[PDB]
Every structure is written in C-alpha cells, then in structure tokens.
C-alpha cells in the first residue's frame, strides 16, 4: 500500500535541485568560514527525539566541520592555511555528509563539493637578481637588444590564470634619465627590449634600464609588481 512511506522521508533532501551541494570559497579563507549555510536535509538530528544521524565521510585532512543540529558546514583551518597555489595545490575539497535514517536504517550520502578560488596572493619573481646586455654602438634603431626574459628566465608568478601571467614595462630611472627614452618594450607580454635611439660610445657607455614586472589581475589595484634592472653596456666599433 505504501502507507508507512512517510518514515522513509527523513534523510532525503528537503530542497529541490540536483543531489550534490556545490559551494565556492577563496583560498586562505579564515578558520570558521561558513561553507554551507544549511544542508536542507529532511529530518532532525538533535532535539528531544532525533529522526536522523548526520556525520562526515571522506573528510580528508579534516578541512570541514559539521554541526549536525543546525546542519552547518564550516572551514577548519586553525594553525594552517587553505592554499590553492603550489606546493599545496588545493583546487577543490569533496566530502560526504552521511545521513542515517534512525527509524528505518537507510543511509543516504549527500556529496559536498567545494570549489577553491585563486586569489592574487603572490607577486612576480625574477629568476635572476639582475639582468644584462651588450650592444654594439652601430646597432640600428629598431633592433631587439635583450631577450633574457624568454622561457621563464624572467618573471614568473605562482598564482593561476591572469593572476600569474606577466607584463613588463620600462620605468623612468632618476639615476639614468635617458634610459627609458633610448629603450622600449613594444610587446609588454614578452619583455623584449629594443633600441629606440641612436647610440654613441664617445658620449655614454652604460644605461641602467629599470623594468617592472606586474601580474594581470582583473582588478587593476589587486595587481602586484616586482622591479629589476637591465644594465646595457656599449661595446666599441
């Protein structure tokens, strides 16, 4: 007849929608952040006469805490950090909320999937502490004279996507005012430097070019920058 079916109802989702509960948080979120407001599972852990048992399974490294009564999930990260970037590489956390129906003994697992979003929490890093080029004085304007940021020998950034990709731009140098006029970076994504003005070994033999790497965070004021110096020495002939 299915008369006593109401008793199989506890442990089923009270909400509609698909079976997995999916949420997102930023990396490095603080201990105690509420991952899931309310699991919306039919029935009642706690109270005078509990109809269900809730617990967490496959909670690898105990990132999640459950409050069975309120059916809340919290981030547990005391004494550590939730790092999406290497070498932790936590892109997502999957746990199961186990619900055992007390009356009938059925077991339903409600999967929770947490998407960890990348923050721009790292700055670019230059492989070397400074960079160098030698140029012949007869080198014509428009020639590429430096190439040393090619192939991860310049700036890299351990963040993901645009937060991790670099743009190089020459800065004005108060200790060498003509250097940003004599040299340009036409393509900021490569960081190759080309000669913009004629050289003269009889008048000046060294240029101190300051180059700033910035990453490409969506929000211009979230961007991070690192500075290096390219020293260009003229050779004779």
């Amino acid at each position: 007849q299915y008369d006593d079916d109401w008793q199989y109802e506890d442990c089923k989702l009270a909400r509609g929608g698909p079976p997995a509960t999916i949420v997102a948080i930023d990396e490095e979120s603080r201990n105690g952040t509420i991952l899931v407001d309310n699991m919306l599972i039919k029935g009642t852990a706690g109270g005078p006469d509990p109809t269900i048992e809730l617990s967490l399974k496959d909670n690898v490294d105990y990132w999640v805490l459950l409050d069975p009564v309120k059916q809340m999930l919290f981030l547990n990260s005391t004494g550590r950090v939730l790092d999406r970037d290497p070498p932790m590489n936590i892109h997502s956390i999957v746990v199961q909320v186990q619900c055992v129906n007390k009356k009938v003994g059925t077991v339903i697992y409600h999967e929770v999937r947490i998407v960890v979003r990348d923050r721009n929490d790292n700055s670019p890093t230059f492989k070397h502490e400074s960079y160098y080029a030698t140029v012949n004085e007869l080198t014509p304007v428009g020639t590429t004279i430096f190439t040393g940021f090619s192939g991860d020998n310049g700036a890299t950034d351990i963040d993901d996507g645009p937060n991790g990709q670099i743009e190089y731009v020459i800065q004005y140098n108060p200790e060498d005012p003509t250097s940003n006029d004599t040299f340009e970076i036409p393509l900021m994504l490569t960081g190759n430097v080309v000669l913009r003005k004629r050289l003269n070994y009889e008048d000046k033999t060294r240029y101190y070019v300051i180059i700033q790497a910035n990453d490409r965070a969506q929000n211009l004021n979230e961007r991070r920058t690192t500075t290096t110096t390219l020293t260009v020495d003229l050779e004779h002939h």
Binding site: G105, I108, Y109, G161
Partner: protein, 208 residues
C-alpha cells in the same frame, strides 16, 4: 604609436563555476562566452587543451559553446576548461571550473548472483537466512538502495535497508518444497526511481 588594448572575458562564471547537467544532449548550447575589447576589435573565441577540445566546440564569432560528446558524472565529476579570446594582436585565456551535475541514470546492480539457499523445514521464525546486495553509483537518494519482495511473501521478509532475508512463518516441507521469490532493488530518486529484479531460490530440506 597607438598600443593595443587586450580583450577580457566578462562572464560571471569565471569568478565562480559553471554547472552542466550530465543529461545535457550532445549538440546543446551550454553557455555563451562574452568578451569586451576597448578597441572594439573583432574578437575570436576558442577552447584550448586536448581534454577540453573533445568535450566542447566554440562558435568563433558568437561565442556559443556546444557540447561535443556526452558527459558522465559517474566517470568524471568536473573539468577545468581553458577558454580564449583573441583580437588578432593577442590571445588571452581564462580557466573555468565545470561541475558536472548528476541525474539518476543508473538502476542498481546485484552482486553474488545466482541467489540460492538451503534451509531445514524446522528453521525458526525470525531466523536470518540470506543477505542480498545491490549497489547504485548515482548520488544521494538516487544511489541509496531499498530491497523488497515482489510480491511480499507470507513465509519470508527482507529488510529494506540491509537486504537480510528472514523467515516469518513456519515452514512445511510437505506443503511446499521450494520458493522462487523476486527481489526488487530500487533507488530512492524522488521523480525518477530506477530498479532491478533478481531471483532468490529458497530450497527447503526435510528432517523426517
């Protein structure tokens, strides 16, 4: 002279995630990429990566994204997919996390068949005599198996959660020598439950 401004995606999902259901048919539009370029250069959309490129096609001018082969939540639950937009002077790329959403698309599967068990006619009422088992890989209610006899029997019951068969009425070898019961294993999906049948043979042996 007049340096190019690169395009950037504007879809909201790049900041969060994209949910696509596993029942989405091959050929269906799953989203539409959106980009802005301040120069207003004509933009060209693409998908990058071997895995990504076999699952998704991208219409280059409009940016609609189609599914090329069927998803299966049971095989892979999520992908990270790298999309691209280019303006002819440069290509920019941004990853999106794609969460495959589950539907109840699996009936339970029984294990240890064939089911057959010998018992003596004087087996007491309440004796557990056999355990049936089926599993279902769907998520949640759609993966939680309930057992029943179709129809219910006056001589045997099956625990609906645990699959334990017990004897519920006194057996008489002279009246009935063997039983052929049909066990049903169903999942508990709300709108689309799926179920499988299995035979349980119960052979009675005599003392006199």
């Amino acid at each position: 002279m007049q340096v190019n401004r690169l395009p950037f995606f504007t879809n909201h999902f790049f900041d969060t995630y994209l949910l696509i259901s596993e029942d989405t048919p091959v050929g269906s539009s799953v989203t539409q990429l959106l980009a802005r370029d301040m120069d207003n250069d004509p933009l060209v959309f693409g998908v990058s990566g071997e895995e990504a490129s076999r699952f998704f096609a991208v219409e280059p001018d409009t940016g609609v994204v189609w599914l090329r082969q069927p998803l299966d939540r049971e095989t892979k639950s999520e992908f990270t997919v790298e999309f691209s937009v280019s303006d002819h002077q440069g290509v920019i790329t941004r990853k999106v996390n794609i969460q495959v959403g589950d539907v109840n698309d699996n009936a339970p599967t029984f294990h240890n068949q064939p089911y057959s068990v010998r018992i003596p006619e004087n087996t007491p009422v309440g004796t557990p005599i056999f355990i049936v088992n089926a599993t279902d890989p769907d998520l949640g209610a759609g993966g939680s198996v309930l057992y029943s006899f179709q129809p219910p029997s006056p001589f045997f019951a099956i625990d609906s959660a645990r699959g334990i068969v017990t004897v519920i009425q006194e057996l008489d070898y002279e009246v009935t020598q063997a039983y052929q019961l049909t066990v049903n294993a169903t999942d508990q999906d709300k709108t689309r439950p799926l179920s499988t049948l299995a035979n349980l043979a119960i052979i009675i042996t005599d003392l006199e």
